[PDB]
Write a protein that binds this ligand. Structure first.
Ligand code: FE
Ligand code: FE
Ligand code: FE
Ligand code: FE
Ligand code: OH
Ligand code: OH
Lengths: 83, 491, 322, 491, 322, 83
């Protein structure tokens, strides 16, 4: 349990998303879309969801776990479309 | 025979003396007056452009009130309110909640200048400033009170600022910073100059005009009269700014204005923006919230600032740009999160509405249009639940408003984060952050609603919990202003 | 779903459909909503500290201040109808006694009295406005504030009469310095240092209950007895019908302030402790009221009697509330 | 401290004295006061039920005017008048022409009582009566004056009673008889009792209500306020009638009331009847001109007359009957002869209108319906010219209104003719004739419009001539209020 | 088709967008429409005859009376704003001098004066209302009527003050007969028969021009100089500040009537004949004005001087118009 | 030339009708209908128009001339339907 802020690509607003310290970057990206995809942003299944620290641009591989990114509670992240 | 006013006016405000039995600083504590090292004798140069005396006041404001109260009496029974555009009714319920008690609280703001300010013209003008806001608060209660039987939502004219509902907090965030927790000279700048002279007076005009166009004259007259009072105490900032520049203080003054205007802009971008461009029927829209702002607020600020010896705030180019985006953000948020507010948000994304929107804001449909596409699809397709939320958005830690900006094909939503003494704050503009930085001690341990959620201050810690904590129940909780009318246009 | 109500939620089950007054006045303040952080900001701001210290931590306590009600039930709209009328009447007195040239019929003695004893009141009167204004913004209830709000404008009212009359006196008697001299008199005339000191020191009593006592319960009846009562009957006896009248008029205002002040005191005595709390500030301040009356009334004709009549009348105000 | 009013009121009206230097009769000429042999001392028993003093007057009527003038100011620009039912606009243009200057002329009527009446309560009450009608005349000018740019027809608010247009003459016929050419005691009976207490007050209520229903609040408020003043001088008749009965004079009093009411009824049956039952949209008709009259005028008269010691006028059973017929007559005449009036008469014979008409007036369609049948056929069939006239109708020689009554299957149009000193007069009711008979000297050589035509007083002596002689030109000349809209219902 | 106009038809080509006053006041009367038969009825009715004789056949002639304009431009709405204010001011004087018990501070002499010289004015004042009221309804123009209309209410105003003050005087001095005695005084006191006769006879001058002269040009300045001016300054000197003031107030009303009367005279002198016509009625009536002043002012203290001051002041009214 | 008042059967209002002193009762009846028939009252051609003095009921044969009826100028008459 670890709260984060979610700047979802092509959405209008950063949102509060509870995630787990063990969730993988992939699994973060899923918990986020629940709140953006098909609410406000159209699904893109030629494309893969990535998870990148908002402050500085840095980027996370899909299978990396929260506990290992050393985020600050309530740290904002981008949930971007890639391939 | 009576004297000409010109003949004796000065004696009303000839009221400083040298204290003997208490010291100057005991009498005028620096935390309350913010005399700022400038001599009593140099404050005495304060000269308000628009002068009034007591009998003239009680005489004019009698007829002012006679009139408005008679309009209200006359139209009362016709009950216009039950056949008004519901985009309208909403505008009213929003306004009353946000303004009534804040107006009332302005009198204390003025009562601040009227006891604590070193310039005596200011002290007397501030007394009618006090007298002014007492009306506003009182009148803005009597009026919505006719409608308490119609919807519980009208109770919020009184109850709003007593709650922890996200807007109420946004409002207190603005006003308490601006007018309640600052010294005399500061209030005169931040409130009367920046907010009343800069924003309110023009808004109140706009709002009366719009009230009229919508066929609501009781309201048309109410706003219209409150505006007649603005000029008389709104003036009070100018002469202070004058005095400050003319000594060692253009920076301190400059800074306060910079702050005052941004914060003003932000509150404004969520209470007025959305109404102008969404709640008001299409055939009643004279001009865009963008145009309006450019014509009726921007030039006027530059005008004022040139005349005073000041320069445009650092953020000005940015501000210009933001007129294209910020409010549709705030609109989208308000509507999406419509059960968290006490009025019923008009969607305002019918086809025609959408072209109009694309006329005034080119490249709207390829940004804001996108989200609304998904929303509409969902309502066409019988899945509405995906148009209400399951989470809070991130709240700017200054303006106490969601962090929201351009989506779609030109996506540009940013969070201006700051770590400060352990805590990580979140900011919705370059400016919101910077406001904090120059005054960290002033905001340090305040907590927006999201922080409260997170610190376990909101219990149960789910959505229903936050609903209760913001004193919102079914019946005041907001829904689509038109009961999803504009949907049929898409099937 | 939440039902529409007969009146404001905070007012339900009153059993008297609420008055316009109960409607526009009550439960207005919000900073009393979170005594620990009154203002929607950092809890450590100087203004936060001020409201906690001087408003919440008053030794004068009630559990519901919002239960207060102004006996006159004054609202902005009805303060102005009241006062519009009273200003017609005085603007009328000004207009018409001028017409007569009433100012010309006054003696060189009486005129000298005025410049010393009447026109400097512009300072004392404005000072009261500050003291009265200050109550506004620290009082713990929107109804207490409002009472104060209106009291303050009356104070303004009086400054204006006095400023007006000075211009006219300066007009009719240019050699006297009218309008130019008052500051000095205020500041240096033994008659005025009784009052000046009392008022200078009341103006820094920051606690709302102490302000209300210091200003409304002690200082005002002294100023009212000395400047309106005594200088009033003397003016009438000395030829000055205008000031005889002008003063009698201002005293209707003062009598209304004594009503709402009385009312609030009646309210505080519902709770154990408060009579003492109030008697204690009285006894701190009163000695200065006496000093103020003494130095002013004795410089007058019939000095020693003016001092006695006034002391007892102003004391009387307070006895009548306990 | 002020005195209770009760304490000193009497002294205001304690004002008779015995003249010495002129005689009682020089001071109070019988032709002006109509003291009628009754002693000054017995007039002093006159005691008006509703008492007011000067300061109380100027104080109340200040706020009255502040209010209405502020309503007018507020709604002014919204310009409701250009989207009002044209049946409405007509009602307004008719009212203003008929009332404005007649109201103004009422003040002279009261000025009559206030100089010439022997009872001093009457003289002072009559002074506010004067003061009252001055407002009415003045206010009823300022108001329509906002519309002089809209149609020349609005000039008629001022110009109507200055012309010889048949209604104007009907109006002067009523009023000059009632209020201008009679002694003090007579005016108090005929005008204040019979017309104001009996008809106007109720009409003015009805009219304000109707104004409101039609969405016209400026007017709604105007009428509404003028009505608040009625009671205060309308009272004045009662106490006189009281005094007259209580001496040798129930017959003389009785007679005056008999006259006053009929003449009132007649004017009323052409200015109000047609509006109630025709000009007012169908869904705004609360009740029939018949019902209205029965409920709000008839019972009230009987009430008043019982209390006073008087009996119902001889004609009462007849009057009852006439409520079914007279106004549709006057309607039909007005509309048929619509270019002779200054408003645009609503036809009001659409199908639904016609059933409503048959509901409230059973056997309407088999009388009044007939004529309207022929009219409609003619408009369906492209022959409209047979719906305007080529002749004058016969004018009652009292009420100066056409002689008209039930047609169709139950045809009952009668002329009550009288030959008197060579001349043959024509009367529209049993009563109109009888009015004349009891006062032949009073009407003897007056000539209605038809007489004028006939005596060669109207030149050229064709229709265009009478048009010019009644100061009517295209542009004020009346046409169908809806531009023959309701025709399409028949094809 | 007839075009919509900028203003009323009867007002077009004025070149000054017309005032609210020109709008609600002008060309109102219609009976002047047919001088041979003014009223829509038999031309031989007693009222027809009255209007022909006393209104149309006045030797005081103009070709357009409707061209008249009240210099104060008074309308119902602005007569009441004016007067509401002036009534506040006097109701205020009543309220507050009572407060003081001003009535108690007057001497037995001064009181006796009042009952003789002040309170009977209720009759003279009402009489003026009748005379002023009568002008209303025979004047040949709606603007002349209106001026008269308002003048008449002021007259009422004065009757009321005087009635009010009597009740209060009867209250404060019950043994005097206040309110009970005035008729007799009016009718039998040599001081009052100057006036009574003048007014009784003016009240039967039926011709509008003679009424206007008889009442406005002759009688009113006499009543105004004798009862307001003289009894006014004497009251002030004799201790009575209230009547000193009350009277000064009524005189603002009188000064407005002198304005509209002056105005109408200025208008009549545009035409040959009228100065003479008016000088002739003056000379008929004036002798009674003098008689009225004489019998009233000489019963006063300083009799002979009051008579001279008043005569010359009232004469002055008329000289100032020619 | 002689003016009369015309109380036409089944119409609502008596109307002024100029006639000639020589016109026959029939011809009177025609000059009247011009103003009522097909304006307000439906023609009835199974029926004949008669002309009768309004005051007293008396009735005029069709071929009688105005000059012979000894009417008073502005005398009212009924124009009734008969056979
Ligand atoms: Fe305000
Ligand atoms: Fe403001
Ligand atoms: Fe009226
Ligand atoms: Fe009336
Ligand atoms: O304001
Ligand atoms: O009336």
């Amino acid at each position: 349990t670890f709260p984060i802020m979610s700047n979802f690509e092509r959405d209008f607003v950063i949102q509060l998303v509870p995630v787990d310290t063990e969730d993988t970057m992939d699994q973060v990206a899923e918990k986020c879309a629940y709140h953006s995809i098909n609410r406000r942003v159209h699904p893109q299944p030629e494309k893969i969801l990535r998870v990148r620290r908002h402050e500085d641009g840095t980027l996370f591989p899909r299978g990396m776990i929260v506990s290992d990114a050393g985020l600050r509670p309530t740290e904002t992240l981008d949930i971007i479309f890639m391939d | 025979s009576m004297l000409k006013r010109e003949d004796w006016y000065d004696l009303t405000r000839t009221t400083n003396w040298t204290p003997k039995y208490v010291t100057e600083n005991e009498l005028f504590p620096e935390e309350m007056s913010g005399a700022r090292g400038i001599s009593m004798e140099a404050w005495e140069k304060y000269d308000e452009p628009y002068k009034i005396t007591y009998p003239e006041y009680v005489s004019i404001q009698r007829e002012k009130d006679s009139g408005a109260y008679s309009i209200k009496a006359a139209l009362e029974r016709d009950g216009f309110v039950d056949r008004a555009d519901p985009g309208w009714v909403s505008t009213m319920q929003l306004h009353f909640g946000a303004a009534a008690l804040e107006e009332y609280a302005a009198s204390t703001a003025e009562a601040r200048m009227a006891r604590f300010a070193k310039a005596p013209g200011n002290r007397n003008m501030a007394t009618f400033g006090m007298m002014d806001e007492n009306r506003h608060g009182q009148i803005q209660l009597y009026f919505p009170y006719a409608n308490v039987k119609r919807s519980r939502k009208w109770d919020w004219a009184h109850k709003a600022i007593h709650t922890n509902e996200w807007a109420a907090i946004a409002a207190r965030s603005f006003f308490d910073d601006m007018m309640m927790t600052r010294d005399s000279v500061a209030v005169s700048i931040m409130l009367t100059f920046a907010f009343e002279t800069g924003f309110s007076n023009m808004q109140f005009l706009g709002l009366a005009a719009d009230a009229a166009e919508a066929g609501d004259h009781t309201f048309a007259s109410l706003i219209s009269s409150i505006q007649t009072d603005e000029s008389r105490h709104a003036q009070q900032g100018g002469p202070s700014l004058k005095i400050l520049v003319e000594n060692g203080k253009k920076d301190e003054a400059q800074q306060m204005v910079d702050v005052a205007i941004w914060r003003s802009w932000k509150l404004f971008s969520v209470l007025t923006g959305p109404i102008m461009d969404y709640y008001t029927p299409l055939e009643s829209r004279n001009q865009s919230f963008k145009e309006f702002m450019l014509e009726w607020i921007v030039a006027q600020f530059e005008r004022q600032l040139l005349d005073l010896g000041l320069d445009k705030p650092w953020y000005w180019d940015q501000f210009m740009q933001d007129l294209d985006e910020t409010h549709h953000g705030m609109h989208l948020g308000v509507w999406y999160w419509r059960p968290t507010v006490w009025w019923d948000p008009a969607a305002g994304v019918s086809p025609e509405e959408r072209e109009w929107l694309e006329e005034k804001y080119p490249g709207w449909n390829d940004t804001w249009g996108q989200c609304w596409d998904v929303i509409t699809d969902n309502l066409v397709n019988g899945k509405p639940e995906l148009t209400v939320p399951e989470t809070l958005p991130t709240i700017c830690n200054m303006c106490n408003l969601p962090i929201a900006h351009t989506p779609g094909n030109k996506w540009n939503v940013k969070d201006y984060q700051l770590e400060y003494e352990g805590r990580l704050y979140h900011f919705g503009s370059e400016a919101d952050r910077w406001c904090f930085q120059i005054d960290p001690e002033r905001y340090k341990n305040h907590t927006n609603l999201v922080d409260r959620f997170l610190k376990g201050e909101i219990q149960p810690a789910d959505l229903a919990g936050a609903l209760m904590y913001m004193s919102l129940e079914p019946g005041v909780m907001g829904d689509d202003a038109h009961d999803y009318e504009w949907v049929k246009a898409y099937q | 779903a939440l039902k529409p109500l007969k009146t404001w939620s905070h007012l339900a089950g009153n059993r008297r459909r609420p008055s316009e007054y109960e409607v526009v006045s009550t439960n207005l303040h919000y900073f009393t909503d979170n005594p620990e952080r009154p203002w929607e900001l950092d809890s450590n701001l100087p203004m936060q500290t001020w409201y906690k210290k001087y408003c919440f931590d008053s030794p004068l306590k009630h559990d519901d201040w919002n239960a207060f009600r102004d006996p006159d039930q004054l609202v902005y709209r009805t303060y102005n109808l009241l006062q519009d009328g009273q200003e017609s009447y005085v603007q009328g007195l000004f207009d018409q006694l001028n017409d007569r040239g009433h100012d010309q019929m006054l003696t060189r003695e009486w005129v000298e009295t005025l410049a010393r004893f009447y026109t400097p009141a512009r300072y004392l009167f404005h000072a009261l406005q500050m003291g009265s204004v200050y109550i506004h913004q620290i009082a713990p209830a929107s109804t207490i504030t409002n009472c104060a709000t209106y009291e303050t404008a009356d104070h303004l009212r009086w400054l204006t009469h006095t400023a007006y009359r000075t211009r006219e006196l300066a007009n009719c008697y240019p050699d006297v310095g009218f309008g130019k001299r008052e500051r000095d008199v205020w500041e240096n005339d033994p008659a005025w240092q009784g009052f000046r000191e009392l008022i200078e020191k009341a103006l820094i009593a920051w606690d709302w209950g102490e302000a209300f006592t210091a200003i409304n319960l002690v200082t005002k009846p002294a100023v009212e007895e000395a400047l309106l009562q005594q200088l009033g009957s003397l003016a009438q006896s000395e030829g000055d019908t205008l000031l005889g009248l002008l003063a009698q008029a201002q005293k209707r205002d003062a009598e209304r302030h004594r009503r709402w002040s009385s009312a609030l005191v009646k309210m505080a005595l519902e709770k154990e402790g408060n009579r003492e709390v109030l008697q204690k500030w009285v006894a701190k301040w009163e000695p200065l009221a006496d000093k103020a009356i003494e130095a002013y009334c004795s410089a007058l004709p019939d000095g020693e009697n003016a001092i006695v009549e006034a002391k007892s009348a102003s004391r009387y105000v307070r006895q009548m509330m306990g």
